[PDB]
Structure 1
Amino acid sequence: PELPEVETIRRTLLPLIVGKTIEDVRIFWPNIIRHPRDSEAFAARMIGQTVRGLERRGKFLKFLLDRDALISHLRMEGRYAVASALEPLEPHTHVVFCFTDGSELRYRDVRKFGTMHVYAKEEADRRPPLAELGPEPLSPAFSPAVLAERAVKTKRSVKALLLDCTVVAGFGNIYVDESLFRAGILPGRPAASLSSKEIERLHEEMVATIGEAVMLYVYGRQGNPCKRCGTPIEKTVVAGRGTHYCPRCQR
């Protein structure tokens, strides 16, 4: 899921697990667990902790417990569900947190691609994967001035810049293509080639696109007419990713 979907998950999941105490943690694909390296240690440390909150940073969910934070990334296909311990698990369930009330928080992923890290709460923000995360795209800390500073110091494309999690947190491939289209900027443009007016227009569209979705012009629309000018949308590879643009609207 993208950042707006992660925010929805954070909002809806919290009341379903807040105040529940972990009684067991079952791990069916150990590779999901990244810290501690031993999944038996990951399971053992969670037991007896109560869920106190749920925050989001970028596309990461941070489950706040008594002493620990569990930091979770779903990638494209991960999903959480809260359900009864009496019912059969859905396919591709890799990690289950069993609560003392007979309910469970279940993690499901066909692609087996998500990650989980557990640290003492106070350590979480200074260790992987949160450690070098950039500002929230909807926060004042992400300003056109911060964006200009990163753009001018790199040789990379503007698309590669926006994909960099140290520049802005959790801004997905879909939103990068959509924001660049709305801003009228080609995704292959060197980031340092952007004018001051382009930078602020880009920031503005980034904030609008992501802000709208939390409260498509190009992505996946290749070979189809641009909704603004009727030019067929093109697809290319930029920064190793599928990249969608209108070659007339974007410059």
Structure 2
Amino acid sequence: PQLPEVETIRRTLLPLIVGKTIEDVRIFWPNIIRHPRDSEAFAARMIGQTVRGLERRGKFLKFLLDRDALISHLRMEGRYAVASALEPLEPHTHVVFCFTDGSELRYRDVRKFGTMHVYAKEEADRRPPLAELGPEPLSPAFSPAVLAERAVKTKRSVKALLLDCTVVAGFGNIYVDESLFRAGILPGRPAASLSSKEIERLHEEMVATIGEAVMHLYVYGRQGNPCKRCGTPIEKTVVAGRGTHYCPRCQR
């Protein structure tokens, strides 16, 4: 799920778990647990804590408990569900939080790609994976000025820049390509080559693109198909080590 979907999960999941107390934590794929390193310590420490809140930073979910925070990333295919302990688990369920009321928060992931970190609340923001995370794209902290400053200092492409979690939080591959199209900027352009005008335009489209989604596609996955603005076939290449989609007429 992308940032907008994660925000939706945050909003919808909260009332389903707030105020519930953890009675057990069952782990069927220990590698998901990244901290504490020992999955048995992870499970042991959460038992007895009550869920108090649920926040989002980038694409990370931060479950707030009594003493600890659980930081969770779903990557591409991870999913949470709240359901009864009396029913069979769905396929590819890797971690289950059992509540004293007989309900469960279950983490599924066909790809087994997600991660979980638990720390005392007060430590979470200064430890991985939240440490170094850039500003929210929808916050005033993410500004043309901030973007311009990172752009001038690097030799990387503008796409590589936008994908950098330290530059801006949780801006995924799809929104990078879409924003660059809407801004009229080629993804392979050196970040430092962007004029002041292009930076302002890019920031504007990044906010608009992600903002609209939080509340169709022009290029992503549309290779070989006509651009919706000019009719030129959308092309796909590899930039910054990822599938990259663009219109060679609209973007310069």
TM-score, length of structure 1 as denominator length: 1.00
SS at 2:150's partner residue? Answer: helix
Could you tell me how far 1:147 is from its partner in structure 2?
0.1
SS at 2:218's partner residue? Answer: coil
Provide, for residues 123-182 of structure 1, a one-character-per-residue CA deviation record: whole Å limited to 9, x for no partner.
000000000000000000000000000000000000000000000000000000000000
Match of 1:14 in 2: 14
| Residue 78, structure 1, aligned to residue 78, structure 2 | yes
Could you tell me how far 1:80 is from its partner in structure 2?
0.0
Measure the CA separation in 2 of the matches of 1:110 and 1:167. Answer: 29
Provide, for residues 186-243 of structure 1, a one-character-per-residue CA deviation record: whole Å limited to 9, x for no partner.
0000000000000000000000000000000000000000000000000000000000
Provide, for residues 15-69 of structure 1, a one-character-per-residue CA deviation record: whole Å limited to 9, x for no partner.
0000000000000000000000000000000000000000000000000000000
Measure the CA separation in 2 of the matches of 1:168 and 1:189. Answer: 18
SS at 1:221's partner residue? Answer: coil
- Runs ≥4 residues deviating over 3 A: none
| Residue 227, structure 1, aligned to residue 228, structure 2 | yes
Could you tell me how far 1:119 is from its partner in structure 2?
0.2
Measure the CA separation in 2 of the matches of 1:101 and 1:236. Answer: 51
Measure the CA separation in 1 of the matches of 2:209 and 2:201. Answer: 12
Could you tell me how far 1:7 is from its partner in structure 2?
0.2
Written as runs of structure 1 = structure 2, the 5 A alignment for 1:1-251 is 1-215=1-215, 216-251=217-252
Measure the CA separation in 2 of the matches of 1:67 and 1:222. Answer: 49
Measure the CA separation in 1 of the matches of 2:140 and 2:25. Answer: 38
SS at 2:129's partner residue? Answer: coil
Measure the CA separation in 2 of the matches of 1:223 and 1:2. Answer: 24
SS at 1:118's partner residue? Answer: strand
Measure the CA separation in 1 of the matches of 2:135 and 2:197. Answer: 21
Measure the CA separation in 2 of the matches of 1:48 and 1:232. Answer: 57
TM-score, length of structure 2 as denominator length: 1.00
Identity among equivalent positions (%) equals 100
Measure the CA separation in 2 of the matches of 1:128 and 1:143. Answer: 24
Could you tell me how far 1:94 is from its partner in structure 2?
0.0
RMSD over equivalenced CA pairs, Å? 0.2
Measure the CA separation in 1 of the matches of 2:204 and 2:240. Answer: 22
Could you tell me how far 1:73 is from its partner in structure 2?
0.1
Structure 2, unaligned stretches of length 5 or more? none
SS at 2:26's partner residue? Answer: strand
